[PDB]
Design an enzyme around this catalytic site. Structure first.
Site, PDB file in Angstrom:
ATOM      1  N   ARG A 124      -0.148   7.292  -0.328  1.00 34.90           N
ATOM      2  CA  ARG A 124       0.302   6.761  -1.620  1.00 34.90           C
ATOM      3  C   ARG A 124       1.184   7.792  -2.343  1.00 34.90           C
ATOM      4  NH1 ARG A 124      -3.011   6.316  -7.182  1.00 34.90           N
ATOM      5  NH2 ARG A 124      -1.419   5.308  -8.423  1.00 34.90           N
ATOM      6  N   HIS A 158       4.893   7.111  -3.693  1.00 39.75           N
ATOM      7  CA  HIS A 158       5.267   7.132  -5.107  1.00 39.75           C
ATOM      8  C   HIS A 158       6.331   8.162  -5.417  1.00 39.75           C
ATOM      9  CE1 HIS A 158       2.072   4.594  -7.281  1.00 39.75           C
ATOM     10  NE2 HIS A 158       2.207   4.223  -6.020  1.00 39.75           N
ATOM     11  N   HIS A 216      -1.353  -0.727   3.250  1.00 38.11           N
ATOM     12  CA  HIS A 216      -2.558  -1.141   2.514  1.00 38.11           C
ATOM     13  C   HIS A 216      -3.740  -1.363   3.438  1.00 38.11           C
ATOM     14  CE1 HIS A 216      -0.294  -2.279  -1.411  1.00 38.11           C
ATOM     15  NE2 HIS A 216      -0.483  -0.975  -1.340  1.00 38.11           N
ATOM     16  N   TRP A 275      -8.636  -3.222   0.967  1.00 34.00           N
ATOM     17  CA  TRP A 275      -7.964  -4.317   1.633  1.00 34.00           C
ATOM     18  C   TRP A 275      -8.626  -4.665   2.959  1.00 34.00           C
ATOM     19  CZ3 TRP A 275      -5.306  -0.376  -0.936  1.00 34.00           C
ATOM     20  CH2 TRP A 275      -4.417  -0.765  -1.933  1.00 34.00           C
TER      21      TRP A 275
HETATM   22  C1  LIG Z   1       4.714  -4.351  -3.970  1.00 34.18           C
HETATM   23  C2  LIG Z   1       4.481  -3.006  -3.525  1.00 34.18           C
HETATM   24  C3  LIG Z   1       3.335  -2.234  -3.869  1.00 34.18           C
HETATM   25  C4  LIG Z   1       2.519  -2.302  -4.962  1.00 34.18           C
HETATM   26  C5  LIG Z   1       2.555  -3.234  -6.142  1.00 34.18           C
HETATM   27  C6  LIG Z   1       1.412  -1.447  -4.722  1.00 34.18           C
HETATM   28  C7  LIG Z   1       0.162  -1.558  -5.281  1.00 34.18           C
HETATM   29  C8  LIG Z   1      -0.841  -0.526  -5.210  1.00 34.18           C
HETATM   30  N1  LIG Z   1      -0.999   0.361  -4.159  1.00 34.18           N
HETATM   31  C9  LIG Z   1      -2.127   1.114  -4.384  1.00 34.18           C
HETATM   32  C10 LIG Z   1      -2.697   2.074  -3.535  1.00 34.18           C
HETATM   33  C11 LIG Z   1      -2.189   2.409  -2.238  1.00 34.18           C
HETATM   34  N2  LIG Z   1      -0.861   2.250  -1.893  1.00 34.18           N
HETATM   35  C12 LIG Z   1      -0.706   2.733  -0.592  1.00 34.18           C
HETATM   36  C13 LIG Z   1       0.512   2.752   0.115  1.00 34.18           C
HETATM   37  C14 LIG Z   1       1.660   2.000  -0.192  1.00 34.18           C
HETATM   38  N3  LIG Z   1       1.714   0.981  -1.139  1.00 34.18           N
HETATM   39  C15 LIG Z   1       2.985   0.450  -1.116  1.00 34.18           C
HETATM   40  C16 LIG Z   1       3.410  -0.681  -1.808  1.00 34.18           C
HETATM   41  C17 LIG Z   1       2.876  -1.151  -3.017  1.00 34.18           C
HETATM   42  N4  LIG Z   1       1.721  -0.680  -3.607  1.00 34.18           N
HETATM   43  C18 LIG Z   1       3.681   1.020   0.011  1.00 34.18           C
HETATM   44  C19 LIG Z   1       5.169   0.790   0.254  1.00 34.18           C
HETATM   45  C20 LIG Z   1       2.912   2.047   0.486  1.00 34.18           C
HETATM   46  C21 LIG Z   1       3.226   3.048   1.496  1.00 34.18           C
HETATM   47  C22 LIG Z   1       4.012   2.845   2.603  1.00 34.18           C
HETATM   48  C23 LIG Z   1      -1.914   3.422  -0.270  1.00 34.18           C
HETATM   49  C24 LIG Z   1      -2.171   3.948   1.134  1.00 34.18           C
HETATM   50  C25 LIG Z   1      -2.836   3.153  -1.217  1.00 34.18           C
HETATM   51  C26 LIG Z   1      -4.317   3.556  -1.245  1.00 34.18           C
HETATM   52  C27 LIG Z   1      -4.484   4.882  -2.029  1.00 34.18           C
HETATM   53  C28 LIG Z   1      -5.928   5.349  -2.156  1.00 34.18           C
HETATM   54  O1  LIG Z   1      -6.129   6.302  -2.959  1.00 34.18           O
HETATM   55  O2  LIG Z   1      -6.842   4.808  -1.515  1.00 34.18           O
HETATM   56  C29 LIG Z   1      -2.668   0.723  -5.683  1.00 34.18           C
HETATM   57  C30 LIG Z   1      -3.972   1.201  -6.185  1.00 34.18           C
HETATM   58  C31 LIG Z   1      -4.015   2.598  -6.746  1.00 34.18           C
HETATM   59  C32 LIG Z   1      -5.406   2.941  -7.168  1.00 34.18           C
HETATM   60  O3  LIG Z   1      -5.882   4.043  -6.822  1.00 34.18           O
HETATM   61  O4  LIG Z   1      -6.048   2.126  -7.903  1.00 34.18           O
HETATM   62  C33 LIG Z   1      -1.871  -0.299  -6.155  1.00 34.18           C
HETATM   63  C34 LIG Z   1      -2.017  -1.005  -7.488  1.00 34.18           C
END
Ligand SMILES: C=CC1=C(C)c2cc3[nH]c(cc4nc(cc5[nH]c(cc1n2)c(C)c5C=C)C(C)=C4CCC(=O)O)c(CCC(=O)O)c3C
EC number: 1.11.1.5
Length: 293
Positions: free
Chosen positions: A47, A51, A174, A190
């Protein structure tokens, strides 16, 4: 006037130097296994890589991974980045040991290392991001909202120069980690095997029985009886017929997902950077397992 950012190799460094950084991250991932109820730091590092790269704007070459600007308060304070301080703190001892690596190289390499150590595809990685000053930090608000539909997703990702296949592939990350209510207003994982990189995101989208519910932050999310969730933007991938076709493809072809993810993720991490013709080729790091470590 948009900024050319030319990759500049950290002075005198080569593949072996970066493999040592990889290995330090990978060993720390193995050691600090208790984090987040024994998920470990892999997902938050992925993540963080996303970001710090996902602020890029193709129109003016602002944001992106090059400048390592998450180290500045305007960005680590972005509400969209809540929770990522854990990933930064994880990387602090790595940076102390290897003070020659740039911040953008470290944030991006953290994501590559995490994916690979979690049994994901190899992700070719290039060095040479250079730290840029505080006034180059992008404003908050460039990362995507989760409460939106497929049209929003599609339009959002045009700014990052990503097409439908790239978007759907990237969202397969995810499979990793979970949402945390205090960070994002969403709660739950997920899938089940959330510190192992697989195509499970797509299988769960297609095969679980999803119900549109409100969580304790009063936001809608899709929930399954298995204890999984999907954000509205995740679920949009099966609402839109073009995305749905690609979801089905990745649910049915693990190798294809891996190959397409690898390409998209490298591209994400490289957006905005100009690599000189004589730059080194991309590096493919060995996992700890492949090294007998
Ligand atoms: C429409 C596109 C996307 C949206 C709205 C989005 C939503 C989210 N992604 C999250 C976590 C996450 N996002 C992640 C990799 C990605 N996520 C991505 C695309 C999106 N990610 C892409 C592109 C990624 C990488 C290639 C990872 C791996 C996590 C889990 C992080 C964790 O701490 O477990 C979180 C939760 C954060 C939290 O700790 O509560 C949200 C709301």
């Amino acid at each position: 006037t948009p900024l050319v950012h030319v990759a500049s190799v950290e002075k005198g460094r080569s593949y072996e130097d970066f493999q040592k950084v990889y290995n330090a991250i990978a060993l720390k991932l193995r050691e600090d296994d208790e984090y987040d109820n024994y998920i470990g730091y892999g997902p938050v590092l992925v993540r963080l890589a996303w970001h710090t790269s996902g602020t890029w704007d193709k129109h003016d070459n602002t944001g992106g991974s090059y400048g390592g600007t998450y180290r500045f308060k305007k960005e680590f304070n972005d509400p969209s980045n809540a929770g990522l301080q854990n990933g930064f703190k994880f990387l602090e001892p790595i940076h102390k040991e290897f003070p020659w690596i740039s911040s953008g190289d470290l944030f991006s390499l953290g994501g590559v290392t995490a994916v690979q150590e979690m049994q994901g595809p190899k992700i070719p990685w290039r060095c040479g991001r250079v730290d840029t000053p505080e006034d180059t930090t992008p404003d908050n608000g460039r990362l995507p909202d989760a409460d939106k539909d497929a049209d929003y997703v599609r339009t959002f990702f045009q700014r990052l120069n990503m097409n439908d296949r790239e978007v759907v592939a990237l969202m397969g990350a995810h499979a990793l980690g979970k949402t945390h209510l205090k960070n994002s207003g969403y709660e739950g994982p997920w899938g089940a095997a959330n510190n192992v990189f697989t195509n499970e995101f797509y299988l769960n989208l297609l095969n679980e029985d999803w119900k549109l519910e409100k969580n304790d932050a009063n936001n809608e999310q899709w929930d399954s009886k298995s204890g999984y969730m999907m954000l509205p933007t995740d679920y949009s991938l099966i609402q839109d017929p073009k995305y749905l076709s690609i979801v089905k493809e990745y649910a049915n072809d693990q190798d294809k997902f891996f190959k397409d993810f690898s390409k998209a993720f490298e591209k994400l991490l490289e957006n905005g950077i100009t690599f000189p013709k004589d730059a080194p080729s991309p590096f493919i790091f060995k996992t700890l397992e492949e090294q007998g470590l």
